[PDB]
Symmetry: C4
Subunit: 89 residues, 4 copies
């Protein structure tokens, strides 16, 4: 979880650096693009540079497994227990 | 299932409260945004406030596991049985 | 697979009937909306009626598990075998 | 992994050929559409031809299982090991 947590953050930082410089986005919008791309939500418009498109294609393949792995350990063993160890008054 | 059902509803209510106030949406559109964000459908436009963006990023990480957990118990053991206990005339 | 296949089709037909009448879409665009909603792709705009929104919320929760179940049996045991029983010349 | 890798590439090439000719997209935008459709991100607009819509519906059902299978072997046994066989200095 600490590790998975670190990878995800490093992955989102990379994305954020990439999209602010190549697509011209403010940091916050570039992190947002990164997270909604990798969680496969995708509610923003697509990148407008060919360079953005290529990076996004590869970023998607490398990131998704990471992000979803983090999301899965996050849910199965930081929430349910918390949540369940929670019922038992 | 009752529990999972409750968490999902509380999660969608939070989202609904958040998006109506900070993004200025009518309740129904804010629930919709919440559900299509957390089911990773994402067919609406993205939030326009930095505050919306940040909450959405975190809401996505906490909610997805919840919503999908509910969806999964919903399908595996309220439908298939119903559906199957359904074939056998 | 035959069963899963039937449920998915009946689910897409319902969606198609719903969106053509309430949202005013041509059959083909309503099937498309249905499939891209339930596969969580979501690349179309969202429904414009409150009635569309509500149905979509519920359609998403009931359908996703169905559609993905079909997709999963489709891939694991109509493709891989086909595909693999395919290597062995 | 080599096999899964090949199928995904052949699947994206098909999509790319399809969307450049029928939807009139430059190769790169057609590959992009293909990848964001099959990874269920969906942040581009939808196809504008009925022919595009139909192919997309079927492409989605056949491709998703493929693409996600590749993504899953990619993550579980080209990254984690790499990543983990990485901690142990
Ligand atoms: Na999506
Ligand atoms: Na979208
Ligand atoms: Na998705
Ligand atoms: Na989307």
């Amino acid at each position: 979880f600490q590790v998975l947590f670190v990878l995800t953050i490093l992955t989102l930082i990379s994305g954020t650096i990439f999209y602010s410089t190549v697509e011209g986005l403010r940091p916050i919008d570039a992190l947002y693009f990164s997270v909604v791309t990798l969680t496969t939500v995708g509610e923003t418009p697509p990148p407008q540079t060919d360079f953005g498109k290529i990076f996004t294609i590869l970023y998607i393949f490398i990131g998704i497994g990471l992000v979803f792995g983090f999301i899965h350990k996050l849910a199965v063993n930081v929430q349910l227990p918390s949540i369940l160890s929670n019922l038992v008054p």
